[PDB]
């Protein structure tokens, strides 16, 4: 066997896990919702009309352990830009996945400049406006990985640049 060892599992926290958001106030927010007769928590942002958006979400500091390479599985929905009248030039349908490593936990001290970009994350299925109004949810799954980890711990971060995104699952693991 090559068992997976889970380092962080967002959905499994059941809404008890608060992550840091920057700017405080505008940008990402935790919300709750029912999907499949079960309560589901998600981080969300939908500032698609103003177009100078730079909204960051940062995970808690995760202890690396013996992991040298990590796999990050995201599950998310994104709404169709064309579903917003007047949003041609302001609306986007991607977000960015970043990470940073450190030996210590910085707490609320968030320094986006220490973060390196892993990738642009893009949906394979947008949520068109009849899906939205029917409360059906087009889930997308994207996995990435990053190479040899060196410090005691790490953060992951999600930069919104003007998309209407809901992040439902964030799962980080390593393969034994």
């Amino acid at each position, epitope marked *: 066997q090559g068992k997976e060892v889970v380092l962080l599992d967002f959905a499994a926290a059941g809404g008890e896990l608060g992550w840091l958001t920057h700017p405080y106030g505008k940008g990402w*927010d935790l919300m709750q919702n029912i999907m499949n007769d079960m309560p589901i928590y998600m981080y969300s942002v939908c500032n698609v009309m103003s177009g100078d958006q730079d909204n960051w979400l940062r995970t808690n500091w995760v202890y690396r352990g013996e992991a040298e390479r990590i796999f990050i599985e995201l599950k998310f929905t994104v709404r169709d830009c064309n579903s917003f009248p007047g949003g041609a030039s302001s609306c986007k349908e991607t977000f960015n996945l970043y990470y940073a490593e450190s030996d210590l936990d910085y707490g609320t001290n968030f320094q986006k400049r220490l973060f390196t970009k892993i990738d642009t994350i893009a949906p394979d299925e947008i949520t068109v406006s009849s899906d939205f109004e029917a409360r059906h949810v087009k889930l997308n799954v994207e996995e990435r990985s990053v190479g040899p980890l060196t410090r005691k711990g790490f953060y992951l971060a999600f930069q919104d640049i003007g998309a*209407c995104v809901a992040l439902l699952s964030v799962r980080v693991y390593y393969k034994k």
Partner: antibody
Amino acid sequence: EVQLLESGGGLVQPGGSLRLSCAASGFTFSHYMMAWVRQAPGKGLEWVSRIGPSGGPTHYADSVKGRFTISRDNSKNTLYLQMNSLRAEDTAVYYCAGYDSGYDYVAVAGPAEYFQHWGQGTLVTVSS
Amino acid sequence: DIQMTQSPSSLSASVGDRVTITCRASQSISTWLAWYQQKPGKAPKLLIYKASNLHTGVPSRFSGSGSGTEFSLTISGLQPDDFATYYCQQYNSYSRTFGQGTKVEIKR
């Protein structure tokens, strides 16, 4: 430029009926969810009814159910409320209200909806 | 059903003031709360939805906060035309209940 105009308001005996109308202009009516909200004199606001874009799902407040009917004609851009067996308690300004998902900037829809646009309303006095 | 309860029922403020109105739910409503303004003899108008998102056109001196049970509308630097009645409405359930109202009067 979204405009809603209620009409049909007026005086009616207890037990009587009346049919209200809302004439919409300046938008694509077929895409909006429409509703009626009312306001008894000197009191607060009270949701009455709603209807989906297609004529679709209809819901009523427990205080009105079985007595009122909501409908729409998407080719006349008009919203209707048929009010039967009226009582003094139904006396109120009746407001036409609308919601459209294209101006609701949230990733996932809330379960019920809220009112973006409101007409100026029409008074129904039920009294002998 | 879910009952909504606004506090205070009336309030006295001067222009330039910063005033906060409260809205409480008898059971949880996530962030599905809306705030409305009504001046006398006029239709209401939406101020806030999502329990903190500003409707288009609404001045940024309005702001809302809260979740679950407790919510709040704040007006910083009252203008002459903010004296009005303010209503909240939950849209977590189909009953779509509103609060009774909070009337912002002029202090004298």
